[PDB]
Amino acid sequence: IIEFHVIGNSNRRVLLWLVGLQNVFSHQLPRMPKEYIARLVFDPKHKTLALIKDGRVIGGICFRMFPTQGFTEIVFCAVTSNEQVKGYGTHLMNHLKEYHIKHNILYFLTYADEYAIGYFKKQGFSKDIKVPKSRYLGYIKDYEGATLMECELNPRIPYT
Amino acid sequence: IIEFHVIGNSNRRVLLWLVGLQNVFSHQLPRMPKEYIARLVFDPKHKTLALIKDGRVIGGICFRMFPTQGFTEIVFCAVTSNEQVKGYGTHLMNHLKEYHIKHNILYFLTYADEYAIGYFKKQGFSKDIKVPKSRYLGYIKATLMECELNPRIPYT
Amino acid sequence: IIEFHVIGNSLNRRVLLWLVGLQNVFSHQLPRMPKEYIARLVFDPKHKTLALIKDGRVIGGICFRMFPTQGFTEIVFCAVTSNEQVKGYGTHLMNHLKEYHIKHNILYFLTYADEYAIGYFKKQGFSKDIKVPKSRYLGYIKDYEGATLMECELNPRIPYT
Amino acid sequence: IIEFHVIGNSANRRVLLWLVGLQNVFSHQLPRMPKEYIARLVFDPKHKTLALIKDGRVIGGICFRMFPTQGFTEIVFCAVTSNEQVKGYGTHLMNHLKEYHIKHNILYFLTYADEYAIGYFKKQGFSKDIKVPKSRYLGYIKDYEGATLMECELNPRIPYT
Amino acid sequence: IIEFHVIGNSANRRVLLWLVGLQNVFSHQLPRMPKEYIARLVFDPKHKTLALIKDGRVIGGICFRMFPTQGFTEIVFCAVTSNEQVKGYGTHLMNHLKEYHIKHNILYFLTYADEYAIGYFKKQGFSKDIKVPKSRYLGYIKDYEGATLMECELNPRIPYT
Amino acid sequence: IIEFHVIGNSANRRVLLWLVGLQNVFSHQLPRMPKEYIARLVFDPKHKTLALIKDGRVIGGICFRMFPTQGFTEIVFCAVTSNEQVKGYGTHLMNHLKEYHIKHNILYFLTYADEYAIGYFKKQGFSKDIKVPKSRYLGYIKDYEGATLMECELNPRIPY
Amino acid sequence: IIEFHVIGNSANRRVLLWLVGLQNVFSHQLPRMPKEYIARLVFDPKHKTLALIKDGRVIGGICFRMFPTQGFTEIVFCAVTSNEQVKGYGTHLMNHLKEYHIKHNILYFLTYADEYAIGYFKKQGFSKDIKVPKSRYLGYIKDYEGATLMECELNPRIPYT
Amino acid sequence: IIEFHVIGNSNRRVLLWLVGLQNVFSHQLPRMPKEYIARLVFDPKHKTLALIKDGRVIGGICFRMFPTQGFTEIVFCAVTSNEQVKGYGTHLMNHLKEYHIKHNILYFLTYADEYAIGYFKKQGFSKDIKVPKSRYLGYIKDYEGATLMECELNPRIPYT
Amino acid sequence: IIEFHVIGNSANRRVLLWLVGLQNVFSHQLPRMPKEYIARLVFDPKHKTLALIKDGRVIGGICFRMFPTQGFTEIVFCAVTSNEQVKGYGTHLMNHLKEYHIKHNILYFLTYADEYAIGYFKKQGFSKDIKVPKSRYLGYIKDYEGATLMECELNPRIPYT
C-alpha cells in the first residue's frame, strides 16, 4: 500500500513520519549535517511530501513554498536505497507538481549537486532560469558549486 | 559548556534534541531498527537523559521507569563516536543514578551485549540478578545486568 | 482488495457492522463458544479486534485484550471464514497482530488452545513453555480448564509484516 | 420471565447486545438471508425491532420499518429461536406489534411471506388482498420477488394484548 | 414479589432504608459481628450490597467489595432472615451475584467461611484451593483468622440466572 | 497532652512544621544518616509518618512505607527525642502503628535494625525469622548490608 | 558549582527541601535557637531566605524579613555549614543580600547580634550606631534581651555583586 | 466543657456570645457605661477572646490589634463572679498571647485601674513602657488616674 | 557570567532597563549620532537588539532590523563598552546574531559602515561585494553619504556558536 501526504511541523503519527523523513534524507545525503536536515524538516515554514509504504516512510520531498515570491524551493529529495529505480521519485515529483498547481505556484527552483542533476532533468528541470535573480537570491541558499535549476509547471495538464 | 537534561515527549529545542538522540542511538547501535528507536525515544513513558555540549546532543541514556515494580529499565546508552573515552558515559550514568535517588528507585536492570559489559561493570553493574525473574520478565525488553543504588551517596 | 483494521467498541457505523460481522464469523467458526459470550467480549471497550476485510466485508479476525500493566496480551478469538481458510489469511492476521504489539511495547501473547487449534498456534511461534509468571495473568485472562495455555514471545527488532 | 421491548439503533450496552442477539436469531432462523444484510437493517436507525426477551436474553423478535407518511409499516424479519417455537411466542410478538401500531395510528402491515411462513402470517390475519394502493409502497418496501405480498389491516378498537 | 438490586452508598430514601434493613439483617444473623463494623462496611462507598427484596422489604443480601485491579471480589456478609431461610433464597442471591460479576468481568470470589456457613459456600461451588496468588489479596481483604479462606471461580459462558 | 497523628506530604502549616519537626528528631537521633535523605523520605508522598505530639510539638515518630500490593509495611525511621526516651513512648508509637495497620489489613512489618536498637524491635515482637517470601520484598524495601532484616507479624482484629 | 537563590514558603518540592536544609543549617549552627522557632520563621511567608547552593545542596543562607513600610530589613538567621566556613561564603551571601535590597530600594539592615556574632557583622559594614529611630523598629523586629542591635546602611549607587 | 474562640462583629451563635460578653463585662465593670462597652464589643475593629463553658459565656478578653503600630490594646478582661479564682483569667491571657505570637504582635498595652493591676502583674505586665509614646498615644485612650502597663511576648516559648 | 538575549520594545522591567542601557552604550560609543535618533530606533517595535549581559549589566549589543519580506537583516548599531573591548565580545555577539538568523531563515546581513567600523565587519566576514540586488534594499536601509555598504552571506549548514 502506497500513500502520499503533505506534512510538516505546525499528532504522533506525523511526528514519527517526520523522524523517518529526517532519517532517510540524512542517510541518503550523509555529507550534509544531520541537525541541519532535522532543523529544516521540523521548521514550520517547511513542508515535506511523504511517501508511505506499509505505514513506513520510504521517501519524500522537503520543499519550501514562497507564495509571496511566486515559486517553491525544492530542498531535499530522497527515496530509500532498496526502493530506488522503481518510479517512486518520479511519482513524488508528479504529486508535488499537482499539489502546486492547485495552490497556483508554477515555478520550482533548486540548487542541485552533481549527483542529482540527472534526476531533475528527467523531471523537466533545466538550467535556464526565467525567474529573475531579485526574486530568489537570499530566499534560497546559493551553495558554492551547486547548480541552480528551474522547472515551470503547466496548469492545463494532469501530472497525476 | 556541558549540560545534562532529562527530556522526553510529553518545544522545538527538546524536539530537535530528541531527534538528535534518535540519531546517536541509531548510529551507535546500528542493529536496532531506526523506526523502533524512534518510537521508543518519543514514547511518553520513556525518558532520556541527554548529554548536551554547546547546544548539541552528543550522547544520552534512554530509560523507562517502573516505580510499581521497584526498578528502572535502561533502554539505550550511547555517546557519539568522537566524544567517547572522555568520561562522558560515566558522568551520564552518575547523573542517571542521582536522578533515580531523588525519585527513590534504587535498582537498574539492563541487557548488555558482550561489547559493552565492561563499561557497565565499571558503573557497578553485575550479572548477579537480585530482582526476582517474576518481577522483571515482560517489563524489561544479551547479558542481563543489575545495579543497586545507595540513596546516601551523592552520585553528582 | 484485502484490508486490516484494529477496531473496537468505544465508550461510527462501519465499525459497528464490522464488529457484528466479526461476532458472526467467531460464532460460526467456534460453535462451542456461546453467541452472547462472543458478543459481550467483542463489544467490550477494553477488547480490540484486528479485522480482516475483503471487499468491504469481514472474512476473518483476531479478538484480543491488551494488559499493558501486566506486560502481555490475551488472544481471545481467532477465526477465518470457511471458504477463505487454508490460504494464508490466519498467518497474515497473526503477523499484523504481532507488528501492532511491537509498536505498543507488548512482546508476550497468552492464549488457551484446545486440541484442534494448538497446531495453528505452534506454527505461529506459540509454545507450551510459559515464561510469564502465573501471578501476572491468573484472574486477568479468561481461564479455560482442560485447554492448553500457550505463549508467544515477540522480538521488537523484527518486522513481522 | 418474559418482556417485550421496541428497540433500535438511534444505544446503551444492553440494547446493543440485544440488537446483536436479534441479528443472530434472525440470521440463524433465516439462513439464506445474508448475515450482513440482516445486520445493516437491524442497526439502521429507520428500522425498529420488537424484541422478545426471556430471562434477560433474546429469544425472538420482529424487525420492521414504519412509513407514517405512507400510512403503513413494512414487516422485515420475524423469527423465534428453535427451542422456543410452537409455544405462542410468535403470536404474542405479532399482537404486541399490532398494539404498538394502534397507539402510533398506523393500521396496515405489509410483508412478503415465503412458503415456510405464509401459514403463520395467515393465522395472524394477513391476506393476499392488498388494499393499500400499489403506488404507495412500490418505491419504499423491498420487493422480495418470488415471495407473496401480504397485508394485514388493524382494528384500533380492539385490545390485542 | 421478589426483586434483586445491587445498591450502595454513593442515595435516595428507599435505598437508604434498604441499606439500614441490610445492616439489620446482617447484624441479627451475625450476632457476634459488631453492629458498628457492619454499618461502616454496608455504608462504605467502595462496598456494594446485593439486596433481596420481598414485597418492598429487605429479607437478605450479600455485601461485597470488588477489586477489579486485582481481578477478584471479596464476599463480606451473606445473610437471609430467619423465617425465609431454607427456601433457596441464599442460592438465588449467590447466582445473581455471579451473573453480576460475569458482566463486570470479575471471575473470582474470595471469602472467609466459618463453621456455621462453610457448607453453604461449598454448595455454591466454593473450594479451599486458592488459585488467586497470595500476593494479590493479602493486603486488600480483611483476614478473619480462625475462619477458612475459600475461593469460587466463575464460568463466564454459563447463565447463572 | 499526648497526640498521635498519621501525616505525610500531600500540606497545611500545622502538618508542614510537624514534618519538619519529625525530620529534625529523626536526623538528630540518627546522626550518620544524611539529613537530606531523611528529609526526602519524610516529605515523599508515598511515605507516611506517625507523629507523637506533646504540647503541639513533635517528640518522636515512626516513618513508614505501606506496600499493600505486597502485604507488608516497611518501617524506615523510628525515633524519640533524647529527653523523652525510656518512658514507654516508643512502645506506644509502635502499638499505634500496629493498630493503624490492622485496620488497613497490613499484618506484616519489615525493618532493618542495627546493633543500637535491635533490642527495642525485639521487645515489640520483631524477629530475625523472615516469613515474607524474598520474592515479595526485594526491590521495594531499601536493602542495607550490615544491618539485620527483622519482621513482625500482627494479629488481625475485628473492629469494635 | 555555586548558586544563590532567594526563596520562601508562599507546589515545588525542590524549594521545600531547600527550606528544610536551611532550617537544618540554621539549627545546627545556632544551637541556642529552638529548632521549632527556626522552622516557624523559615516557613513563614513574610520571611524570605537567600540560599547558598553548592552542587544542588544547601550549605548556607540568610533568613530575612523585609519591612518596606518601615524602610528596613531584619536579619533573622545567618549561617554557613561548618566545613564550608572561612572561605568567604558568609561575605558573598551578605553581598548578594545587599544587592538584592538595592534593587528593591531597602537601604537599611537591622539585626541583634550576640558577642560571638558581632565580629562578622562588623566586617560586613554593620555598626552599633543605630540611625533608624526606635519608634521605627521596636515591636516590628524581634528584640533580644542582652544582644547588641546592629545596623547596616546600603549605598544604592554601588555594585555589591 | 471549656472552649476559647476569637470572635467579633464582621451567625446567631456568635451574636448571642457577643451579647453574653457585653453582659459579663458590664456586670463586672459597672461604673463603665453599658452602651460604651456594647459599642466596643460590637465594633468591627475590636475582637474578643471568648471563654465558653457549657455553651455559655463565662469570661473573655476584649482586645484591639494595631498591627500598623506593632501592639495590641487590652480593653476588657472579665470572668463571671462564680468562676473566678480558678485559673480562667490566666488561661485566657495565655491563649491571647499564643494567638498574638502567631500574628507576630509581641507587645500588649493596657490602661489598668487600681483593682486590675495585680492581675496584670501576675500575667507578666509591668509599668516599664518600652513602646515609645508616639506609637500608642491617641490610639488608646489615656484615662486619668489609670496606669499604663506593658507586656512583651517571647515568640520562642509556648504559652499554652 | 555572560549572557545573550534578543530583546525589543513591543514591556518587562528587566528588558526596559536593558534597552536603556543599550541606548546609553550605543550613544556613548557613537557620540556623533543624535542620541534621540538612537533612542527612537532602539525602542522602535520593528527593531530588535541582541544584548550582551555581564553580571546582570549591559556591556554591549547589536541593534538590527529584520526584513523577512526582503530576505535580509540590516545591522544598525554595534557596540561594546570601552572597558570590555578587545576581549572577543564583539565577535561572540556577531556569531550569536548569525546563529539566530540561520534559525530564522535569513541568510544575508547588510550594513552601512563608517570608516572606523570597516575593519571590524571585515573580520566578521563582511564584504564590499554586494550580491543582493539594489531593488531589494534601497529605501529600506538608509544610504548615508560617505558610508560603505557591506554584506555578509550566511550558511545554514554552519554552527556559528
Ligand SMILES: CC(C)(COP(=O)(O)OP(=O)(O)OC[C@H]1O[C@@H](n2cnc3c(N)ncnc32)[C@H](O)[C@@H]1OP(=O)(O)O)[C@@H](O)C(=O)NCCC(=O)NCCSC(=O)CCC(=O)O
Ligand atoms: C534521486 C532519487 C530521489 C530518485 O529516486 P528514484 O530512484 O525513485 O527515481 P525513479 O522515479 O525511479 O526514476 C529514475 C530515473 O532517472 C534517471 N536518472 C538519471 N540520474 C539519476 C539519479 N541520480 N537518480 C535517479 N535517477 C536518475 C534514472 O535513470 C531513471 O531513468 P528512467 O526515466 O528510465 O526511469 C533517488 O535516487 C535518491 O534518493 N538518491 C539519493 C539522494 C539524492 O541524491 N537526492 C537528490 C538530491 S536532494 C539534495 O538536496 C542534495 C543536494 C542537491 O540536490 O544538490
Ligand SMILES: CC(C)(COP(=O)(O)OP(=O)(O)OC[C@H]1O[C@@H](n2cnc3c(N)ncnc32)[C@H](O)[C@@H]1OP(=O)(O)O)[C@@H](O)C(=O)NCCC(=O)NCCSC(=O)CCC(=O)O
Ligand atoms: C559504551 C559507551 C556508552 C561508554 O561511554 P564512554 O565511551 O564515554 O565511556 P567513558 O565514560 O569515557 O569511560 C568509562 C570506562 O569504560 C570502560 N570500558 C570497558 N569497556 C568499555 C566499552 N565497550 N566501551 C566504553 N568503555 C568501556 C573504559 O575503559 C572507560 O575508562 P576507564 O577504564 O578509565 O574507567 C560508549 O562508548 C558508546 O556509546 N559505545 C557504543 C554504543 C554502546 O555500546 N552502547 C551500549 C549498549 S546500549 C544498552 O544499554 C542496551 C542496548 C542493547 O544492547 O540492546
Ligand SMILES: CC(C)(COP(=O)(O)OP(=O)(O)OC[C@H]1O[C@@H](n2cnc3c(N)ncnc32)[C@H](O)[C@@H]1OP(=O)(O)O)[C@@H](O)C(=O)NCCC(=O)NCCSC(=O)CCC(=O)O
Ligand atoms: C485457525 C484458523 C484461524 C487459521 O485460518 P487459516 O486457514 O487462514 O490459516 P493459514 O494461515 O491459511 O494456514 C496456517 C497453517 O497452520 C497449519 N496448521 C496445523 N493445524 C492447523 C489448524 N487447526 N488450523 C490452522 N492451521 C493449522 C496449516 O497447515 C496451515 O498451513 P502450513 O502448515 O503449510 O503452514 C482457521 O482455520 C479457523 O478459523 N479455524 C476455526 C476457528 C479456530 O479454531 N480458532 C482458533 C481457536 S480460537 C482462540 O483464539 C482461543 C480461544 C479458546 O479456544 O479458548
Ligand SMILES: CC(C)(COP(=O)(O)OP(=O)(O)OC[C@H]1O[C@@H](n2cnc3c(N)ncnc32)[C@H](O)[C@@H]1OP(=O)(O)O)[C@@H](O)C(=O)NCCC(=O)NCCSC(=O)CCC(=O)O
Ligand atoms: C414463523 C415463526 C416466527 C413463528 O413462531 P412461533 O413458532 O412461536 O409461532 P406460534 O405463535 O407458536 O404458532 C402460531 C401458529 O402458526 C402456525 N403456523 C403455520 N405455519 C407456520 C410456520 N412456518 N411456522 C410457525 N408457525 C406456523 C402454528 O402452527 C401455530 O398454529 P396454531 O395457533 O393454530 O396452533 C417461527 O416459526 C420461526 O421462527 N420460523 C423460522 C423463521 C421464519 O420462517 N420467519 C418468517 C419468515 S419471513 C421473514 O421474516 C424474512 C423476510 C422475507 O423472507 O421476506
Ligand SMILES: CC(C)(COP(=O)(O)OP(=O)(O)OC[C@H]1O[C@@H](n2cnc3c(N)ncnc32)[C@H](O)[C@@H]1OP(=O)(O)O)[C@@H](O)C(=O)NCCC(=O)NCCSC(=O)CCC(=O)O
Ligand atoms: C447461610 C445462609 C445465608 C443461606 O441462606 P439460605 O438458607 O436461604 O440457603 P439456601 O439457598 O436455602 O440453601 C442452600 C443449601 O445450603 C445448605 N447448607 C449447608 N450448610 C448451611 C448453612 N449453615 N446455612 C444455610 N444453608 C446451608 C442448605 O442445606 C441448602 O442445601 P441443599 O440445596 O442441598 O438443599 C443462611 O443460612 C443464613 O443467613 N445464616 C446465618 C448467617 C450466616 O451464617 N451467613 C454466612 C456467614 S459468613 C459472613 O457473611 C460473615 C463474614 C465472616 O464471618 O467472615
Ligand SMILES: CC(C)(COP(=O)(O)OP(=O)(O)OC[C@H]1O[C@@H](n2cnc3c(N)ncnc32)[C@H](O)[C@@H]1OP(=O)(O)O)[C@@H](O)C(=O)NCCC(=O)NCCSC(=O)CCC(=O)O
Ligand atoms: C529506639 C527508640 C526509638 C526507643 O524509644 P524509647 O526509648 O521511648 O523506648 P521505650 O518504649 O521507652 O522502651 C521500651 C523498651 O525498649 C527497650 N530497649 C532495648 N534496647 C533499647 C534501645 N536502644 N533503645 C530504647 N529502648 C530499648 C527498653 O529497655 C524498654 O524495655 P522495657 O520493656 O523493659 O520497658 C529510642 O531509644 C531512640 O530514638 N533511639 C535512637 C534512634 C534509633 O536508634 N532508632 C532505631 C534505629 S534502627 C535502624 O537501623 C533503622 C530502622 C529505623 O530507624 O526504623
Ligand SMILES: CC(C)(COP(=O)(O)OP(=O)(O)OC[C@H]1O[C@@H](n2cnc3c(N)ncnc32)[C@H](O)[C@@H]1OP(=O)(O)O)[C@@H](O)C(=O)NCCC(=O)NCCSC(=O)CCC(=O)O
Ligand atoms: C558567621 C558565619 C555565617 C560567617 O560565615 P563564613 O565563615 O563563611 O564567613 P567568611 O566570609 O568566610 O569570613 C569572613 C571573615 O569574617 C571574619 N569573622 C568575624 N567573625 C567571624 C565568624 N563568626 N565566623 C567566621 N568569620 C568571622 C573572618 O575572619 C573572615 O575572614 P577575614 O576577616 O580575614 O576576611 C559563619 O561563621 C557561621 O555560620 N557561624 C555560626 C552561626 C552564626 O554565628 N550566625 C550569626 C548569628 S545569626 C543572626 O543573624 C542573628 C540572630 C540572633 O542571634 O539574634
Ligand SMILES: CC(C)(COP(=O)(O)OP(=O)(O)OC[C@H]1O[C@@H](n2cnc3c(N)ncnc32)[C@H](O)[C@@H]1OP(=O)(O)O)[C@@H](O)C(=O)NCCC(=O)NCCSC(=O)CCC(=O)O
Ligand atoms: C481580674 C479577673 C479577670 C481575673 O480572673 P480570674 O479570677 O479567673 O484569675 P485567675 O486566673 O483565677 O488567677 C488569679 C490570680 O491573680 C491574683 N491576683 C492579684 N490581684 C488579682 C485580682 N484583681 N483579680 C484576680 N486575681 C488577682 C490572684 O491572687 C490569683 O493568684 P494565683 O496566681 O495564685 O492564681 C477576674 O477577677 C475579674 O473578672 N474581675 C472583675 C473584672 C476586672 O477587674 N477585670 C480587670 C479589669 S478590665 C477593665 O478594662 C477595667 C479597667 C482597667 O483594667 O483598669
Ligand SMILES: CC(C)(COP(=O)(O)OP(=O)(O)OC[C@H]1O[C@@H](n2cnc3c(N)ncnc32)[C@H](O)[C@@H]1OP(=O)(O)O)[C@@H](O)C(=O)NCCC(=O)NCCSC(=O)CCC(=O)O
Ligand atoms: C567595534 C566593536 C563593537 C568591536 O567590539 P570588540 O572590541 O569586543 O571586538 P573583538 O571581538 O574583541 O575584536 C575583534 C577584532 O576586530 C579587529 N578589527 C579590525 N578593525 C577593527 C575596528 N574598527 N574596530 C574593532 N575591531 C577591529 C580587532 O583587531 C579585533 O582583534 P583581532 O582581529 O586580532 O581578533 C567595539 O570595538 C566598539 O564598540 N567600537 C565603538 C563603536 C563601533 O565602532 N562599532 C562598530 C560598528 S559602528 C555602528 O554601530 C553604526 C555605524 C556603522 O555601521 O559603521
